[PDB]
Amino acid sequence: AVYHMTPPSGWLCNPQRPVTTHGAYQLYYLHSDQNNGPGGWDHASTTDGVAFTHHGTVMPLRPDFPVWSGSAVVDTANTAGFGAGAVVALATQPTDGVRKYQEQYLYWSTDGGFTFTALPDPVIVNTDGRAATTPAEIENAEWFRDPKIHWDTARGEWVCVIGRLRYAAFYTSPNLRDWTLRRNFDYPNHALGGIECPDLFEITADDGTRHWVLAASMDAYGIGLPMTYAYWTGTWDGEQFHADDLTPQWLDWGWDWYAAVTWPSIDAPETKRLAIAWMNNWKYAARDVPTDASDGYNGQNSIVRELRLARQPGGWYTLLSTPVAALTNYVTATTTLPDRTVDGSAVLPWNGRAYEIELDIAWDTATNVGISVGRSPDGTRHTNIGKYGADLYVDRGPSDLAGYSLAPYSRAAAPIDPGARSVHLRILVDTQSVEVFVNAGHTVLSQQVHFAEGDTGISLYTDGGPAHFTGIVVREIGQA
């Protein structure tokens, strides 16, 4: 990947919410030497959200004691007693290597999050596990992970949300060590998924109102929905979370945007948040990838995006997404191409493997319009991005690579007004991925695509009528 974070080597997995220290973002992420094997937390730093500097392991795997997802906060006020400004983290670990014993262990750092020390006794015990007898009880005790901590300014205390089987548990604490159980958060459509890597935060909307947001990585594929990140706007009152609407909204409609995490930006923590996700999907994550053979590593993170909460008619709010602005600083060349009308298909006179392409498409009677990226000159390979019916789709099927096929997960789609007769697209193409930001960023589709060396072309196509392709600009991107 030219501009997507990847591990120097090994298996990359769940990113952990970055903390801000030493004037930079300290990102942590699950890492293992063996693909889908046990591991711990590794560390990387980024000043702009694009380029990263890897620092190695920070919370190592220990004999039959791996470290799973969690979160870290800067104890500015020294509420935990490990020193003012100490970086305090909570992570799920299966005690004694026993899955039903998975509980939350605390780790702390006094050097801005570079080295950590472990607290021998877990701060949030899995009592369910030490009583689970029936299959149901055990299955439930085996889903108690990914603690996400948030400082509730209004109540002056720490609140933590933990993922369970189809529900989320909440705990509060004044010192990060002594936690008090609160009321679970239940949602009605369990076909949605069961809550992993939950997110909890406060953000101020474009109208100045403040809001809480509870989210989590799901798996609603069974009901035609994403396997990414869903969120419920609402309020946390210290006892329970009140979702404004029990039907959640989605942040990505692509195949690969899992275990996403968000964090407040440096320049505007209350209104703008940054977000990054592991670009993989458990339907096929456990396998070797092209990069394994070519570079000895497996997995990359998504591009970092900026989020903001916008008010909607009726009084509800929704998040909008956009590529981190800093990406612009890595643009090495900018190519504009003349507007053109095409009826059928046309190959653009440009080739590349890592770039961003923006364009507008307008049509009338056409029943399908789109653009193909990663097009091989032999015409057999390409990823299609277009509008059809009520879908703004991304079809990576024609890009399936022998020995690494992503089939049958080929056509992803975001909802789009079926009456739309034009659309704006901003597409980020890298060596192993395609990320599509639609229109104003309300819908985004992120997916890994295994492009071959020669998959460099771009073509335009329509079905059922001509379309006018305008404002075509391609920005080549170079790494650091």
UniProtKB/TrEMBL annotation:
Keywords: Glycosidase, Hydrolase, Transferase. GO terms for molecular function: sucrose alpha-glucosidase activity; transferase activity. The keyword Hydrolase applies. Residues 338-474 form the Glycosyl hydrolase family 32 C-terminal domain. InterPro entries: ConA-like_dom_sf, Glyco_hydro_32, Glyco_hydro_32_C, Glyco_hydro_32_N, Glyco_hydro_beta-prop_sf, TAT_signal. Pfam families: Glyco_hydro_32C (PF08244), Glyco_hydro_32N (PF00251). One of its GO terms (cellular component) is cytoplasm. One of its GO terms (biological process) is sucrose catabolic process. Residues 4-311 form the Glycosyl hydrolase family 32 N-terminal domain. PANTHER family: EXOINULINASE INUD (AFU_ORTHOLOGUE AFUA_5G00480) (PTHR42800). Belongs to the glycosyl hydrolase 32 family. This is Levan fructotransferase. It comes from Paenarthrobacter ureafaciens.
